[PDB]
């Protein structure tokens, strides 16, 4: 199989995946919170729903568009990076560790966000999980640089 | 060629690369909204097409927006796990099927965004669509986890 | 190195890899704006940076949502495109004129949009940089179809 180009490969994969599924747990989780409250974007979608009134914005449905749009300024990058990265011979156990802290990491902000915790527990999870992208980042940087 | 790595890559490569272009017309279309509409994001655009009362939020330019982001919500996600399904080995035709629903679906749903069709068109396309995503997701997970 | 896959490869990596930090620049640059204006998207933000009454809208924090939502429009489909581009065999030079007009044309747009420069500034940076990866999307358009 071709998961095992590179050694790194396979756990770059199992965490990315679980990334874009989360992704996927939050899209959901916006759909059910705009039918509960009946908040939705669109005039015909308020028609189908009990009346125009219902084309409205709300404040969940508002939380749950943030956490989706940061998903995509965070986690898109590190579909990249971390691929990029998994081609570059790092040691096996460090480049499991910058997934794993990635991952761990952005679990744990879609829980901070959703679930409304005190500050500054999401900004954390945010700085913590960007740590890794920002390493792999600068190794990709050199790499690529020397090649030129 | 190295667009034949896999015997899926070039109907993937195909069906993704329409997908950018199928993105880059919502982003044409955008444009063409805000000047029809004169609804401008920022105050410098606005001096620059008629005056300042033309920095304003528009019904129609918002619903590009949406159309857009709705896209990076979904096309992107399959930009990445559509490219590792295309080297997991899998059937042909199967992958085919699940290239070519997701187009369909995604086409679809920017008709019936921004034509402001009766639900719940927009939510079956957008429904559609995402089982092929789920399905690859799913097997990425699987060839993955076996492989650590 | 696996970054020697292709000639044009090394130039795409360091591009790219540039243009994901810019994204985190303005990432960056929206935390700070936030702080400074004392304009926080989530109540809980609020409470813990003086009271409940900064949890409020700036239109300097949304010009930097904008900036770099922007960026998610148009940076991440060149990560695709640019990285599919790279295997196509390309003109080395040609390969380096796409990747290079791309980089400047968005580092130019970001300081036209965060530094309010005065229109068309900002659109033609980013008419600009669309350029090459509508060259590139029709490039792998015609390798794809030719390979099916
Ligand atoms: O009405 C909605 N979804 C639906 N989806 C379906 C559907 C989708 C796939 C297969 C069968 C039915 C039938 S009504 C909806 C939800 C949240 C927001 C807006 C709308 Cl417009
Ligand atoms: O005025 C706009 N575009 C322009 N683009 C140009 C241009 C771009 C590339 C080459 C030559 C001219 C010249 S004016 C504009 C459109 C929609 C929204 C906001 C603005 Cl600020
Ligand atoms: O308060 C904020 N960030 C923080 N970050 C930290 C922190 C992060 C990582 C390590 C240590 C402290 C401690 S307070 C903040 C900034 C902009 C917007 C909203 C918030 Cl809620
Ligand atoms: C990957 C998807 C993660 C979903 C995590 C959702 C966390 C929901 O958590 C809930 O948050 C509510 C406030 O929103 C609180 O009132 C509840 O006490 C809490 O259980
Ligand atoms: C890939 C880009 C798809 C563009 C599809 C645009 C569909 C435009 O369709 C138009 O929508 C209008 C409402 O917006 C209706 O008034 C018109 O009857 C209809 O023709
Ligand atoms: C990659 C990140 C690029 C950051 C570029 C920020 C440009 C800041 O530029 C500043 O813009 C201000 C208005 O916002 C002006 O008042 C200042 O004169 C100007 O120096
Ligand atoms: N787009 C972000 C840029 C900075 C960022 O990502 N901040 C983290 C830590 S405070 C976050 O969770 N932001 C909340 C959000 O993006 O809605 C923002 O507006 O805050
Ligand atoms: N971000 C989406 C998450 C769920 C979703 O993607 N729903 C589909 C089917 S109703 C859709 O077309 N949403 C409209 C949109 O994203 O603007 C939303 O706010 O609705
Ligand atoms: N989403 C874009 C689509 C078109 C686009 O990308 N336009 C360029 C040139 S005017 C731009 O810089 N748009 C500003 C923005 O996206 O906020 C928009 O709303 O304008
Ligand atoms: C906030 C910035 C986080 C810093 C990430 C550190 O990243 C480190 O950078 C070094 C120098 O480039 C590299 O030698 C090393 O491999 C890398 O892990
Ligand atoms: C809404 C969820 C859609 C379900 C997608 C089904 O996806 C299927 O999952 C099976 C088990 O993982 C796999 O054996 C199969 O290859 C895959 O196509
Ligand atoms: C606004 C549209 C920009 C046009 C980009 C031109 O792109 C060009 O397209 C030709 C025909 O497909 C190709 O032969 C050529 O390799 C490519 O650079």
């Given at each position: 199989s071709?998961?095992?180009?590179?050694?790194?490969?396979?756990?770059?994969?199992?965490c990315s995946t679980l990334l874009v599924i989360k992704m996927y747990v939050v899209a959901?989780?916006?759909?059910?919170?705009?039918?509960?409250?009946?908040?939705?974007?669109?005039?015909?979608?308020?028609?189908?729903?009990?009346?125009?009134?219902?084309?409205?914005?709300?404040p969940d449905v508002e939380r749950c568009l943030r956490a989706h749009r940061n998903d995509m300024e965070t986690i898109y990058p590190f579909l990249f990076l971390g691929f990029v990265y998994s081609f570059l011979g790092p040691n096996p156990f460090v480049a499991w560790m910058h997934f794993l802290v990635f991952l761990v990491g952005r679990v744990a902000h879609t829980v901070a966000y959703l679930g409304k915790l005190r500050a500054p527990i999401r900004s954390v999870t945010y700085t913590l999980a960007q740590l890794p992208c920002a390493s792999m980042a600068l190794q990709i940087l050199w790499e690529a640089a020397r090649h030129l």
């Open positions: 071709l998961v095992m180009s590179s050694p790194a490969l396979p756990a770059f994969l199992l959901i989780i916006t759909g059910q919170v705009r039918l509960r409250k009946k908040a939705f974007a669109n005039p015909e979608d308020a028609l189908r729903h009990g009346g125009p009134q219902y084309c409205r914005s709300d």
